[PDB]
Each structure stands twice: as C-alpha cells, then as structure tokens.
Amino acid sequence: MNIMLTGATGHLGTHITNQAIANHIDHFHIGVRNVEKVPDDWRGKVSVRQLDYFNQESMVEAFKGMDTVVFIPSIIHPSFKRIPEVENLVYAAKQSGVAHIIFIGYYADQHNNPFHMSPYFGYASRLLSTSGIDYTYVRMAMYMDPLKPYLPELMNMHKLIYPAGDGRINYITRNDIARGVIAIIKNPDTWGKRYLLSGYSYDMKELAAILSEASGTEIKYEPVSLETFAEMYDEPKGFGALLASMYHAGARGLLDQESNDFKQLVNDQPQTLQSFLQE
Amino acid sequence: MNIMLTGATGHLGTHITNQAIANHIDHFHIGVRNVEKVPDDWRGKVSVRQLDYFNQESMVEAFKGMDTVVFIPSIIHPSFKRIPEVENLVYAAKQSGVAHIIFIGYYADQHNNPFHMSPYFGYASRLLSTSGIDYTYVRMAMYMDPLKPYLPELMNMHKLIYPAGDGRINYITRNDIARGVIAIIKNPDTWGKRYLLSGYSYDMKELAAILSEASGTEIKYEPVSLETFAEMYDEPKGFGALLASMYHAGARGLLDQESNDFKQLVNDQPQTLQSFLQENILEHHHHHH
Ligand SMILES: [Mg+2]
Numbered sequence A: 001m002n003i004m005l006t007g008a009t010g011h012l013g014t015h016i017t018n019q020a021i022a023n024h025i026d027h028f029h030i031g032v033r034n035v036e037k038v039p040d041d042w043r044g045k046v047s048v049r050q051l052d053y054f055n056q057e058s059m060v061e062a063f064k065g066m067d068t069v070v071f072i073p074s075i076i077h078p079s080f081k082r083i084p085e086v087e088n089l090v091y092a093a094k095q096s097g098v099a100h101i102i103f104i105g106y107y108a109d110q111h112n113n114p115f116h117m118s119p120y121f122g123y124a125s126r127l128l129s130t131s132g133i134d135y136t137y138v139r140m141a142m143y144m145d146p147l148k149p150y151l152p153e154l155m156n157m158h159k160l161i162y163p164a165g166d167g168r169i170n171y172i173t174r175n176d177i178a179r180g181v182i183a184i185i186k187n188p189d190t191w192g193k194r195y196l197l198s199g200y201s202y203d204m205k206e207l208a209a210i211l212s213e214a215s216g217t218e219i220k221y222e223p224v225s226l227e228t229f230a231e232m233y234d235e236p237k238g239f240g241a242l243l244a245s246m247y248h249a250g251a252r253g254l255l256d257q258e259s260n261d262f263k264q265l266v267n268d269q270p271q272t273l274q275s276f277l278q279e
Numbered sequence B: 001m002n003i004m005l006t007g008a009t010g011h012l013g014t015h016i017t018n019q020a021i022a023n024h025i026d027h028f029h030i031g032v033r034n035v036e037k038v039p040d041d042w043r044g045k046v047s048v049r050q051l052d053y054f055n056q057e058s059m060v061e062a063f064k065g066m067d068t069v070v071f072i073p074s075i076i077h078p079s080f081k082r083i084p085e086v087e088n089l090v091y092a093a094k095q096s097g098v099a100h101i102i103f104i105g106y107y108a109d110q111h112n113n114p115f116h117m118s119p120y121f122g123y124a125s126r127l128l129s130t131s132g133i134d135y136t137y138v139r140m141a142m143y144m145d146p147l148k149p150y151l152p153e154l155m156n157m158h159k160l161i162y163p164a165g166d167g168r169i170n171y172i173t174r175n176d177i178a179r180g181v182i183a184i185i186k187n188p189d190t191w192g193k194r195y196l197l198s199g200y201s202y203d204m205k206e207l208a209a210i211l212s213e214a215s216g217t218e219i220k221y222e223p224v225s226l227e228t229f230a231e232m233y234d235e236p237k238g239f240g241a242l243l244a245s246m247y248h249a250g251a252r253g254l255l256d257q258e259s260n261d262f263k264q265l266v267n268d269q270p271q272t273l274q275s276f277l278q279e280n281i282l283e284h285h286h287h288h289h
C-alpha cells in the first residue's frame, strides 16, 4: 500500500516522517515543493516526489500509483487563498485513482467559529464528502509547541495576554498528533471515520500558572484587547487579526473540545503541558 | 433603515419582494443583474440598483447607503465557482458600511453532507462568523414548488425516481420561506440568530402517494441509480451529478431536518404538499370537454 505524505517538511510533516522512518513503514512517499530541500537524513529512507500545493498538475503526477494520501494543510491565509489546495487535492486524488485520503484538519471549524481559517476547514470537510473518495478526517487541537519559543517573551512581560476571556482551550503536542496519524495509517480498520486528537484543556489562568512554574518566572493572565493583540503581532500583514480571532474563538468557548481518540488509537495518554515544557 | 434584497427577480426573491410590498416595508431596495426583468408593478414601490455578484465593485456600489442586506445566493456551480459571491458580500458590506446581513442558505450543509454545494454553504456561514459583521443565518428546507412542473413527467413514468433510498426529506414552499424571511426583516429582535425554515418531512413513499392522489394517476416510488438520475437530468453540464448528490444526501437521512422557527416567526402552520398541489386543478394530458 503506497502512502504519500504531503507537506512532509513542515512542522507536523517532519514528526510524521521521522516516526514512519523509525517504524520502518513500507512504501512511504513524501511530497515536497522543491526536492533539494529534503533532509539529508531522509535520503534513501523515503521516496521523494515533487509536489506544489498550488500547481494542480504537480499533484496529479505526484499521486500516480498512490493508495493513501495524508494531506497537511498549508499556512496560507486567508481562507480564500488556501481553498485552491483542497480543490487540487480532490482533483488529483480522483484523476490518479487515490483510494483513501487522511486529511489533517484544525478543530476551530464550527459553523459559528470566528477564527479566520474556519471557512477553509468547513469547506475542506464538505468537499471531501462530495468527492466520493474514502477519507479519514482528523481534527487536531491547538499546538503546544509554540509555547516553548514564546516563553522568553512571556517571562519578559510577566504576563500572558491572549484575548481569550475566561474560555478553556484544548492543547496537544505535534508529536502526539503525529502519533495518532501514524496509528491511523497503520490500521485500515480506523479509516473512514472522523477523529479529534485532543490533549488537555486549560483556561488562561491555569495556562499562566503552568508557564510560571516551568520558567520559574511569575506570569499572570492579563489579557489585552483583540485590537491591541492583533496590532502588536501583525506580522506578516493580516496575521495579527487572524491570530487574535483564534483566541476570540476560545473566549466563546469553541476551543474546549475533548475526546479519547488519542488513547483509543495510540493506547496511551497524551503528553501534558507540564511534561512537554519540562522536556 | 435601508434594506436591500439581492437577487430579487429570482424565484424566491420575487416572493420576498411582493410580500415586502404587500407589508408596506419602506426603504426597500433591490439589487438585480438585469433591471429590465423587474416587474412594472414594482416601479415606485422599491428602489432598483444593478448588481453583479461576481464583480466586487458592483457589490460595493450597490451597498452604499444600505443598512441591512438580505442575500440570496446564486445557482452557480460548483462550490469553488460560487465562493467569490460570499467573499464579495462581506467585502462590500464592510467597505460600504452595511450593519447587518441576513443570509439565505440551504439546509444541506453539514460537515458530511454529500450535496455538491455543501462546501459553499459551510464556507458562507463561517465567513460571516469571521467577518465581525452582525448577521442572521436563515437555513431553508427543499422547495416544494418544483414538484408541480415535474408532475407531467412523473405521471408519464408512473414512478418517482429520486435516488433517496428510504430517507425522509423536509420540504417547504417558497411562499412559506418568504413569509419567514419577511417576519425576520420586520422584527429586528429576531436578528443575530440562526434559523431553519422547515415545512414537512416525507419519505419518498409518502411523496409518491401524495402526487398520485393529487394527479389522479398511479405513481409508485421506484428510485433509479445515482448515475442514471444524473444522466437523464444533466443540464447544464455538471448539474446532473449535483442534483443526484442532493437526493443522495436524503438517502443518508441528512435532509430530515425540522424546527419550530416557522411557527414561532409567522405564527402559523406551514403549507402541506397536498394543500400546495390542491392550489389549482392540475392540467391533465387528456381533454375533459
Ligand atoms: Mg519551498
């Protein structure tokens, strides 16, 4: 069974690829926009194919002979600019006879979720449904990973300023999301179902406490306005409002989502934020 | 408070506009692609502006001075081709200062709904949410109206062929959808909420029985394959599979959706299919002199 992982060199893709190599998964292929940008450590361990998300032809060719495609959305924004990649995914899958698609989606996708990328995720799930192709839709919670590099700034401000009100947000590490996806890949009896890979939920007060003990510095939750947040983090342009909208969704309580899918798939509990930061 | 209804000359739009005129709604404007298709009786009762959904500046211009926009989606397909519609709606609403948007969406919009236009409706709802503009999302069930002009063919085959399996599909007249929309427009206290305008759910067996006693001819439910249905109704190109996907969603039980919103909004019961067809004696293919 030929597996094709797109966006393999991105953050999540790197975790999935390294785990697939470590587990010696057979017939594993990766797609990258420019083949020269493949880690030397992967050379000879995985099959490489050129694949550009915004070049329909490249995806049609990259999918030839593939049985299962694991698709990782890009970071392009806003939703209108990202939509073409999912259109290309479905077009290429149909053209090249792909039998199964594992789509990695984000959990901020409700009909009333204000996160700027929610339209893309709502559209993707539905487009897959209309395609007639078997698909496993894996929704993931918010990445824990970004918190580590953010510590320096947090310790400096001595304040957690996410405009998330009193909402509870569920977090999970990329490593764990990857463990779930690999488990799905290895067991076809899990295909065709909808999953939510969640870790643990924390309100911002509890988050600040976890960050405080981890950094040994005192960090208190003192949220700034949505406008102030967007304005001080608007880089690149338009990113500010988008990031703010994500926490705004949390304030509305739309990010307090949990399931035991991780445990049922990996037969283990997700790594806690304390363990992650301590690591 | 200036109200603007887009796509006013369409089937549903005509119902809404005539009802708005009957209810004496003032400050009522309409946005149409072809002003020459506007009924003469509408002259002096509503203000007419020309609009092209797929031309951003056309939408921006049409929305200048408007406070509430009631948007009726086009029939363009597939989803990727219709999307620009909602993008322009939001862009123009912001640019021209529209304070509220009443969006008329279709109920075949769940995350797992196979209907070809589900991506568009899922995208539209979410885009409105991300816009920051106040809005009222009105979802409608399946139109009963198309059944009348279709009877002739059904009578000929003596069979209802919708590939909907044993699923139940909720139906409602355009007249009733319009009454619900008008009720919302007239009372701003109903704004900002999500509504479902439903009528009655019928499995295909009951639908056939209704059409049979209404037509006077025997019509049994003998559904054809999804491929066959798309083939005998593929006009324009692509529409065939789209129509089939709609009934396929019904086969999965995704179209049996009901709510009490119509009754709570209009303070009345929706019109049944039997009543709708009984509106006028059906034209028989034979003479009765
Ligand atoms: Mg590159």
Ligand SMILES: [Mg+2]
Pocket (backbone or CB within 6 Å): A134
């Ligand atoms: Mg299959």
